[PDB]
Amino acid sequence: XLXRXXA
Amino acid sequence: XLXRXXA
Amino acid sequence: XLXRXXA
Amino acid sequence: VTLKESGGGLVQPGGSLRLSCAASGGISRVNVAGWYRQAPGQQREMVAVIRSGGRINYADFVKGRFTFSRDDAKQTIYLQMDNLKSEDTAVYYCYGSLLETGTFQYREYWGQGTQVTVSS
Amino acid sequence: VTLKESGGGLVQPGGSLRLSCAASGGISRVNVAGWYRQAPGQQREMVAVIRSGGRINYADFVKGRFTFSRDDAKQTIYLQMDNLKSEDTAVYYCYGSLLETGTFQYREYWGQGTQVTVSS
Amino acid sequence: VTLKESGGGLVQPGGSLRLSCAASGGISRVNVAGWYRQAPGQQREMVAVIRSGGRINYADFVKGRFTFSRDDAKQTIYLQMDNLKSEDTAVYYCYGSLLETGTFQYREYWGQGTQVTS
């Protein structure tokens, strides 16, 4: 998790 | 203008 | 020829 | 815009054929126009395109045998295909990247294909 | 997975334009996304791509004038282009190197291009 | 000439994947063929290449783990990747420096990448 460009 | 493949 | 990773 | 193909067919090695493609509908600018082919079982490959510079680009296999030309008024492109070989047998597809006079996005268009058989 | 572009257009120098690109279809992960461009006669070149890293690389010629951003849920990337010059006239092409959902082979996708004209 | 990578996928340490990289098109000769690693936010780096010596040369990170091999009639290569680990996972790219049939200019090709996960 943050944003699929990346968690 | 010459010709659309380009004017 | 032998084997193209080498004639 | 629709694309319609003419030409194609069956010839012997050494022979010639001609393809043409006509567009219908409004076109401001052409980004790319030309032909692609696809042998059965095989991947599709560029044959001959013109880009917006005016530069015509021929695939390696052409070796000067095929001639591109265009008739802006008829909105028709042409491939003159001389000195054919059996390995040129394929379905040939008209292609365009066009700006529809409407917007600024380019739309790709394929023709439905044309059979070119080169045997005996 | 398809890629659709919007925006582009005609602006006078110093002016501003936004580009967007929306990915339809399922996307497990992203390796690179972003923008290339091609002026008539010239060769395609990178404008701004984000990589798997997270790092955003701009072309030498961008000089702080363009800004990359993106909406993971809307599967959209944006390029805000400011202080546009006439020399930035080109076709702009969205681009992705992406895993579709299940597959494990990255593939490349190209949008169909957007016109960006900067004149007077 | 065109490269399709195959194999790759998802496993946990002490796991195995097997990469095909298959080349369409005419080829007289191979200057180098191989695989590169790219870890998120790091330099891509060399893993396993065969030069035309025949002198395969591995990256340090390779032990007897990964096992290069080829199928020349079918224009395909393979890397058996045994005992995979998380600290190695990355994007894996096939690589060709090749001579097509009718030319003497070599040309570099890369595959689109292959996700290797752990």
Q: Domains of chain F, with CATH numbers?
A: 3-105 (2.60.40.10)
Using the beta-carbon criterion (under 8 Å), do A5 and E50 form an inter-chain contact? yes
Distance in angstroms (rounded) separating the CA atoms of residues D16 and D79 = 11
Q: What sign for the dihedral angle of Cα E42, E43, E44, E45?
A: negative
User: Considering only alpha carbons, which residue of chain D is nearest residue B6?
Assistant: D52
Can you give the resolution of this entry in Å? 2.3
- Which method was it determined by? X-ray
Distance in angstroms (rounded) separating the CA atoms of residues F82 and F3 = 23
Q: Do chains B and C touch (3 or more CB pairs under 8 A)?
A: no
User: Considering only alpha carbons, which residue of chain A is nearest residue E33?
Assistant: A5
Say how many C-beta atoms besides its own lie within 10 A of residue D37's C-beta.
21
Q: Which chains touch A (3 or more CB pairs under 8 A)?
A: E
Give the closest residue to E114 by CA, choosing from E20, E44, E43.
E20
Q: Look up residue E106 and give its two tokens.
A: 């990255």
Chain C residues with CB under 8 Å of F27 CB are 4
> Which of F29, F31, F101 would you mutate first to test chain C, the one with the most C CBs within 10 A?
F29
Q: Which chains touch F (3 or more CB pairs under 8 A)?
A: C, D, E
Do E12 and E116 contact (CB within 8 A), yes or no?
no
Measured CA to CA in angstroms, residue D61 lies from D48, D84, E8, E60, F106 at distances of 10, 11, 37, 36, 17
Distance in angstroms (rounded) separating the CA atoms of residues F38 and E31 = 10
Q: Look up residue D16 and give its two tokens.
A: 């010639």
Report the gap between the CA of C2 and the closest CA in chain F (Å).
Answer: 10
Report the gap between the CA of E28 and the closest CA in chain D (Å).
Answer: 27
Angle at E71 between CA E65 and CA E72, to 5 degrees: 135
Do E58 and E78 contact (CB within 8 A), yes or no?
no
Do D92 and D8 contact (CB within 8 A), yes or no?
yes
Distance in angstroms (rounded) separating the CA atoms of residues D47 and D39 = 12
Do D1 and D23 contact (CB within 8 A), yes or no?
yes
Do E9 and E17 contact (CB within 8 A), yes or no?
yes
Q: Which amino acid is at E107?
A: R
Burial of A7 (0-12, 13-18, 19+ CB in 10 A): exposed
Given the structure tokens 């998120």, which residue do they identify?
A: F40
DSSP lists the bridge partners of residue A7 as none
Using the beta-carbon criterion (under 8 Å), do C6 and F29 form an inter-chain contact? yes
Distance in angstroms (rounded) separating the CA atoms of residues F82 and E44 = 40
